[PDB]
């Protein structure tokens, strides 16, 4: 529904700090590592021991994406599978499932590029953010064999 506990969307790292997912030092550590590694603060922060669900959950709050409680519940369809292919889905990291409100529902494991494809499609589509473990398996759901 709705949540609010004096959170701050000032920065990705801060967003997690407000919730208390990572230690104050964890943020600085991941940040400093990004300057030497040049990787994503999120993926680099995970090294501290942060769960994927948390790293992705924050991305949805900062990127304003819609996170999926799960994948097993999702109901895939053939029509949606026509939008993107198995290999093509990996090209952008998105996978269709169905349509709602005259829009195309596509679950991708990359909210950062959500706008990249959203702008390329030039059409009304609902972009969700699901874990890499659930999003990967979803491929079998959206792309049923035979
Ligand atoms: N002092 C400080 N600085 C901070 C903190 N958080 C971030 N930063 C620095 O700002 C840039 C920009 O970060 P944004 O908050 O604009 O957001 C991220 C995020 O949207 C996305 N990202 C980051 N990590 C991941 C990831 O693991 N997966 C995905 N899908 N997207 C990810 O990229 C932008 C860019 O952020 P960067 O991590 O490239 O760099 C940060 C920090 O340099 C903070 O708390 N404190």
The domain ranges of the chain are 12-51, 78-142
72 carries a ligand binding annotation = no
Look up residue 6 and give its two tokens. Answer: 């004096």
- Could you identify the atom of ligand 1 that is nearest to the CA of residue 63? 20
Residue having the nearest C-alpha atom to atom 30 of ligand 1: 110
42 is in an annotated binding site: yes
Query: What SS3 class is residue 9?
Result: coil
Ligand 1 midpoint to CA 64 (Å): 14
48 in helix, strand or coil?
helix
Nearest protein CA to atom 8 of ligand 1, as residue: 11
Discontinuities after residues in the chain (C–N over 2.5 A): none
Ligand 1 binding residues, C-beta < 6 A: 11-14, 27, 31, 34, 40-43, 55, 59, 62-63, 110-112
Which residue bears the tokens 């949805």?
60
In whole angstroms, what is the distance from residue 48 CA to residue 73 CA?
Answer: 31
Q: Which among 11, 59, 63 is the best mutation to test ligand 1's pocket, defined by most ligand atoms within 8 Å of the CB?
A: 11
Query: What stretches of the chain show up as alpha helix (H) in DSSP?
Result: 12-19, 24-37, 41-45, 52-63, 78-81, 86-92, 114-121, 132-142
Extract long-range pairs of 96-99: CB within 8 Å, 24+ residues apart. 96/142, 97/138, 97/141, 97/142
CA 22 to chain centre: 19
SS3 label, residue 38: coil
Domain 78-142: CATH superfamily, name plus number: Type II secretion system, protein E, N-terminal domain (3.30.300.160)
Of 120, 63, 65, 69, nearest to 92 (Cα)?
Answer: 120
């Amino acid at each position: 529904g709705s949540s609010g506990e004096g959170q701050k969307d000032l920065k990705l790292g801060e967003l997690l700090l407000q919730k208390g997912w990572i230690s104050r030092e964890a943020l600085e550590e991941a940040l400093v590592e990004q300057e030497k590694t040049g990787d994503l603060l999120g993926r680099i922060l995970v090294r501290k021991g942060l769960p994927e669900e948390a790293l992705y959950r924050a991305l949805a709050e900062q990127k304003g994406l819609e996170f999926l409680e799960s994948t097993e519940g999702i109901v895939p369809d053939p029509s949606a599978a026509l939008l993107l292919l198995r290999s093509d889905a990996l090209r952008y990291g998105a996978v269709p499932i169905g349509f709602q409100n005259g829009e195309v529902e596509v679950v991708l494991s990359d909210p950062r590029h959500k706008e990249a494809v959203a702008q390329l499609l030039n059409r009304p589509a609902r972009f969700y953010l699901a874990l890499p473990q659930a999003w990967e398996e979803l491929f079998r759901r959206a792309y049923p064999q035979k």
